[PDB]
């Protein structure tokens, strides 16, 4: 009947029972993290108003086109040693295979953070830990997590974890610096989850 990516509605059949099943809608799986920390996306290959018999693939899965399995994309190849850039088994590459967005995956990391109640007071997941610049607090809502769809650079604050603890070892130079700047020693230790060094960037989903 209709196709909107997130789902695909199908009529009952050419010869359907009275109240056996009715219409069967196939909720197309959107970009969810696979077991290998990769993307699992499906596209409604069927078009609006196209009869489809039972037993065929309606929407392709991850790395598939027109129902057939497609582990990658076909690229024009020249089996010649180009200036030694493919001296060993290395494979030279053109910018067209990276500019056209043809060999690019998603690889949803889906990092996990906890807020376990430690013995030294319950751990908090509030906005941010003290002694942190405002540049890292960007893309964070009032709850403290990154906004859904906000790009996060490698190392930026992902979820502010405020963990209460005891008084840290009072060092003389640090105490002198704190008295000079007038601030007070934060009783809580910074434990907010941060993205490891990578090119992750955008955030797809933030489940709490």
């Amino acid at each position: 009947e209709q196709i909107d990516g997130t789902r695909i509605v199908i009529r009952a059949t050419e010869e359907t029972d009275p109240a056996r099943s009715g219409v069967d809608i196939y909720r197309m799986s959107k970009f969810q993290r696979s077991n290998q920390s990769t993307c699992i996306n499906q596209r409604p290959l069927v078009k609006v108003g196209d009869r489809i018999v039972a037993g065929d693939i309606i929407a392709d899965g991850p790395s598939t086109e027109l129902g057939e399995l497609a582990l990658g994309r076909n690229a024009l190849v020249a089996f010649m040693p180009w200036n030694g850039y493919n001296f060993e088994d290395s494979i030279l590459i053109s910018e067209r295979i990276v500019r056209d967005d043809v060999f690019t995956s998603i690889h949803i990391e889906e990092f996990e953070v906890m807020a376990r109640d430690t013995k030294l007071g319950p751990e908090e997941i509030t906005r941010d830990i003290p002694n942190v610049g405002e540049e890292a607090l960007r893309n964070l809502d009032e709850a403290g997590i990154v906004a859904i769809g906000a790009e996060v650079q490698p190392g930026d604050i992902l979820v502010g974890k405020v963990t209460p603890k005891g008084e840290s070892p009072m060092t003389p130079e640090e105490k002198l610096l704190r008295a000079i700047f007038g601030e007070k020693a934060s009783d809580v230790r910074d434990t907010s989850l941060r993205l490891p060094p990578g090119v992750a960037g955008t955030i797809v989903d933030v489940r709490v």
């Binding site: 002694n131 942190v132 009072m170 003389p172 105490k175 002198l176 610096l177 000079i180 700047f181």
Partner: protein, 58 residues
């Protein structure tokens, strides 16, 4: 003044003395030591002296 301020916290000596304890080492243990400590603390708060420490406290 630098000596009494260091004795207040301890750079070489780890025995962190209180206000009176560091006071006896210099002069009569009174609010004069606290006054000089406050004056020193407010001294190195300018952009000239506290320049490399502005990015040190985080």
């Amino acid at each position: 003044e630098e000596r009494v301020l260091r004795m207040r916290f301890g750079i070489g000596m780890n025995t962190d003395h209180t206000l009176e304890e560091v006071g006896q080492q210099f002069s009569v243990t009174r609010e004069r030591i606290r006054q000089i400590e406050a004056k020193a603390l407010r001294k190195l708060k300018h952009p000239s002296r506290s320049r490399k420490l502005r990015s040190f406290l985080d």
